[PDB]
Amino acid sequence: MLDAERLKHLIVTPSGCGEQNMIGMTPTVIAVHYLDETEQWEKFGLEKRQGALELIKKGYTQQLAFRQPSSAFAAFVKRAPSTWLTAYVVKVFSLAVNLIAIDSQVLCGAVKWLILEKQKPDGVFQEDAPVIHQEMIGGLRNNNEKDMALTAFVLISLQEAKDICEEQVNSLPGSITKAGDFLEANYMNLQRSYTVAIAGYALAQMGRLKGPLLNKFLTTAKDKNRWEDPGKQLYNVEATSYALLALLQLKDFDFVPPVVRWLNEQRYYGGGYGSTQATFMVFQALAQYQKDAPDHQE
Template structure:
C-alpha cells in the first residue's frame, strides 16, 4: 500500500518533534547545568550523602560526555575534592559492623547503608574510595538485613524522607528490596574480590521483585 501524504507528513513531523525533544533534554541536562551540582557535602549521615551524590553525578556525566570545558576544566578537581570530602565525612557515620546511620547514636539504616553502597560504587573510579568501606556495608546488608523470604527489612527509617522520594506506602518494602538489589548490582564487580555476592544473596530476592535473575 502506497504511503499517503498524510502518513509522510506525520512521520516527518514525528521525527522533527523527536529531535526537538532530544535537543530540549540535552539543553536541560547540559554540562553548564551540571556545574550547579558541584557542591560541598555537609550535614548528618543522610544529608551528607544527599550532597555527595551531586558532585558524583556531575563528575560521572561530564566525564562520559567530555563536557568539562562548559563549566571549566579546573572544576573537575573541585568536584573530586568534594566527593572525597563527602566520603571522609560519611565514614564518621559508619558503625564498626560496616553499616551507616544518620548519627552514630542511632540504629543503622538499611536504606541509608544501601544508598552509601550505591554512591560509593558510582564514585569508585573517580575518587579515593576504600574497597572495605564499601564492601563491608554490602556484606552487612546481606547478612543482617535479608529476611528468609529474600526481601530486605528496615529497622530504622531514614529521617530525611526526601532522600528516598518520601515512599510511604504498602509498596515501601518492595521498593526497599529493589533499591538494595540495585545497589548490590552497582557494587558487585568492586566487591568480587572480597566475597561472592550471588552466593550470599537469597535467590528469593529476585522472586520478591519478580526478577528471576536479580543477581
Template sequence: METGPILIKIRLYDIENEDGSDAIEKILDVRTEGIEKRVEETHFVDLSGSIGKSGKSFAIDGRLPDSTVPGSSINIFVKMEGEVFGQSTSRTLLSPDGVKGLLNAPHGCAEQTMKRMAPTALALRYLDLSQRWYELAPGTRDTALKFTEEGYIRILTFKKGDGSYGAWTHYPTSYWLTGLVVKVMSLVAERQNAGSGEKGRWAQGVSEQHIIDSVRYLLVKQKEDGSFSDPNPVIHREMQGGIGGIEGDVSMTAFITVALYRSLPFLTDNKERNDTKAIISKATDYLLSRVEELQRPYAVAITAYCLSVCLSDRTQAEPAWEKLKGLATEGIVLLHSC
C-alpha cells in the same frame, strides 16, 4: 598540531638523589579552532501510516555551513529507536549545565552528607562517561572531585563498627542509608579505577574494605522471602523519593539489590562475591514474583530498573517495563508517570 586526546606526564625529579619522587598524568584534549556546534533533530516515523504520509518519511539536509573550519571533525549520525522516550529524548534533559547544578559540598549528619554526595558522584560519573566536561567552565571537574572526596571522608566519620550507617553514630542503623553508601562508594571507586585520564587527581581513594564492611552488614538482613525492609527509616524522607509506604518492601528490595550489584567488582573474596550474587538472585526472584500485582509507578519503575541491571537474561525484566509503560500518560511531546 594533531587533534584529540594527548597524554601529558609531569614528573618531579630529585637531581641530588637522582630519583623520581612523584608524577602525575593529565589528558590534554586538543581541538580545532572555532566553536563546536551540534544540531539534533528528532523525527517520529509511523510505519502504520495512521498519521499520514508525512509520518512515514523525512529528508535530512546533509549540506555543511560555509563557516565550517577546514580539517575539523564533521559527522552526521542517524539513530533509530523503538521507544517514544528513548536516549535521544533524555539526552536533551541531561545538559552539562543542568548536571552541574547537582554538584554540592557535603555537610551535616550522615543523611545530609549523602543527600549531597550522591548527586555529586552521579554527576561526575555522567560527565565522565559522556565526555562533556569541556562544555563547562575550566576547573569544574576538580570541584566535583573535591566535593566527592570531602563527602567520602565525612561519611566515614558516621560509620559504625559493624559497617552500617545511621543519621548519627548513636542513631539506629538505616538499611536504606547503608545501601546508599554502598552504591555511591562503588560508583566513585569505579570512576577512580577508570581514571578518565585524570587518575592521579584523586587525593583520597575509596577503600574497598569500607564497601565490603557495609555489604557484609546488608547480606544478613535479607528476609526468608528474599525481600529487604528498613526498621529504622531515615529522618530526611524526601531523599528517598518514592520508597516507603504502600509497596515499600518492593521498592526497598530493589534499591538495596542494585546497591549490592554495584559492589560486586570490589568484593575481593570469591566466596563473598558468590554469596552476594546468591542474595541478589534471591532478591530478584522476589521482585519477579511481585511485578504483576504492583500499582505504584515508583515501585514499578525501580523494580524494572533493578531487574534490567541485575538479571543476566534481561528479557525477564520486560513484563515490568510493559507494566510501567501501561501506567504512563502520553501527550504530544511528553510521556510521564503520575
C-alpha cells in the same frame, strides 16, 4: 543532552551528619559522572573538575564518621543503622569508584551487613530504623509496595557493588538470587509504575525480566515514553530513569529514544529539596544512555 551551562548548581560542598552529608555528596558525584560521559568539561571549565573531585573526596571522608562498627550507616553513631542509607552509600560509592579512592572494606563491609542482618528468609530486605530525612529516598517514601521497592533498591546496590565485593562477601551471589526470586514472585501483582520500573531494572540486571513480566514492564509506560504515577513529578522522573536503565540493560534501543526525549523535555537539572533520588537517577540514566546508545535519537 542536559547542557553543562545548566548544571553549575550541582557542585555542592557536602556537610552535616550521616544523611545530610550524602544529600550533599549526591549532586557533585553524579554531575561529575555525567559531565565526564558527555564530554562537557571544555564548556563547563576543564580546571573545575579537580575541585569537584576534592569535594567528592571530602564527602567520602566525612561519611566515614558515620560508619558504625558493623560497617552500617546511620545519621549519627548512637542511632540504630538504616538499611536504606547503608544501601544508598553502597550505590553512591560504587558509582564513584572511578572518581576517588573507595576503600573496598567499607563498601564490601556494608554489603555483607545488609545481607547477613537485613535480608529475611523470603529474600526481602527490611528497614528497622528509617532515615530521618525521608525526602532523600524518593518514591520509596510512599507506603505502598514498600517491601518490593526497598528489596529492589538494595538489590540494585548489591549488583552495582558485585564486581568489587564478590570475592570478599561469601553471601553475595545467594543474596542476589534470593532477592531476585522475591521480586519475580510478586512483580505481576504490582500496581505502581514506580515499583514496576525500579524492580524492572533490578530484574533486568539479572536477566530475569522476560515473558509477561517484561510485557508488564513495557506496557506500564504511558505513551511509550515515561513511567508515571499520580503523585510527585520527581518520583516519576526517578521512575522513568530506572526504566531507562532497564531498557539499556535489555538492549531495547528502539524503545529508548522517546524515553530520553521525555526526560530531556522535563527540563529537570537536579538539586533542591527532596531531589536526592531524582538527581542521582536522572543523571545516572542519561549518562548510561550516552555511553551505550547515543546513536539512538528521536
